[PDB]
């Protein structure tokens, strides 16, 4: 009962409702039938305050859905800089690989988020990591015409 | 304006009624798409038991409106411009030295959900071949999906070849012929020649006992400057 409400509050970005549910004993690591947790949803949609609350209650920072995605994958994709920082400070695996073998650095470089690429590198992101189809973050940077990112990755190897 | 419907995360449902060399079957799919990242996160289950064909062979048939069209290419996004009324997608698929699939589908919004309803008919397959024999490895390659305008039908013609890995190291080609036409009578964006670049990853839900396929896929448009 509680787990389902928490996922919904976290998805909708309702910080106050999330705090109540946690106080009322909700499973911080609740998961739907496809393995998605409240921290996944908060991280994906940029809800900083919900991410911090969930982590405080012991949310699994490195939980992975069926597609192998962690909260860090999703935040790095969406361009949520502060959440990415929080996740890493709270022990997020910087080089976790989704089912296509994308690392957070792959997704940030692809989607064009320069500042996130720099945070990921700062926390030891593997610049030479290859996804399932052999692509490096640099490869993804050039594919999508993000030259500034391609440059920073170049000088990081 | 049809593109405006894809600014965020959209839920997706897929329904397929399949017939291959007499063996009838159905597959149901659930998940989400987000065209901002050309991304699909879906799960498929065979709702009639053991799937008579390998999962990889049904991928192309099981929502190109979720492809990422970059800014300088949005003029050329037929799939989104046909929304929300939708479009008909028709294919013939020829498996080299083997049988063929033919499919008709409608892709459209039913509510706030984009739905893909499919009929598939397969004929002329070898029972000991790579398909019915299940000799295809459980994965997927990356492909180039070539799109052309078709002013005659006010739609598009699309062509490509799927490469299916065989367990003995050889490859099985599947030749795809497809056309798309609007369901509504509104206008639609007819594109200059271009292609989609596709990536997919097949996987297994550890807590799933039914014959199933977990699908993560990324698609981006390209070939225009």
Author numbering:
A (entry chain A): 13 to 169
B (entry chain B): 3 to 64, 68 to 230
Give passages from the manuscript:
DARPins are engineered proteins that consist of 4–5 structurally similar repeats that stack on top of each other, forming a compact protein domain. DARPins combine all potential advantages of single domain binders over antibodies: they are small in size (ca. 18 kDa), possess high biophysical stability, have very high expression yields in E. coli, can easily be genetically encoded for in vivo applications and are devoid of disulphides and hence well suited for applications where they are expressed in the reducing cytoplasm. Structural investigations showed that these DARPins bind to different but slightly overlapping epitopes.
Surprisingly, SEC-MALS revealed that 3G124nc had a dimeric fraction of approximately one third, in contrast to the original 3G124, which was predominantly monomeric. 3G124nc did not show a clear transition up to 92 °C, a stability which is not unusual for full-length DARPins with three internal repeats and an optimized C-cap. Thermal denaturation of several GFP-clamps was assessed; they show a transition between 68.7 °C and 71.8 °C. This probably corresponds to the melting of the truncated DARPin domain, whereas 3G124nc remains folded in the investigated temperature range. All hydrogen bonds except two (GFP-residue Gln204 to Asp143 and His114 of eGFP) are also found in the complex structures of the parental DARPins with eGFP. The structures of the GFP-clamps confirm the intended design: both DARPin-derived domains overlay well with the parental DARPins when superimposed on eGFP. Most interactions between the DARPins and eGFP are found in the single DARPin complexes as well as in the GFP-clamp complexes, confirming that both domains can bind their respective epitope without strain or steric hindrance.
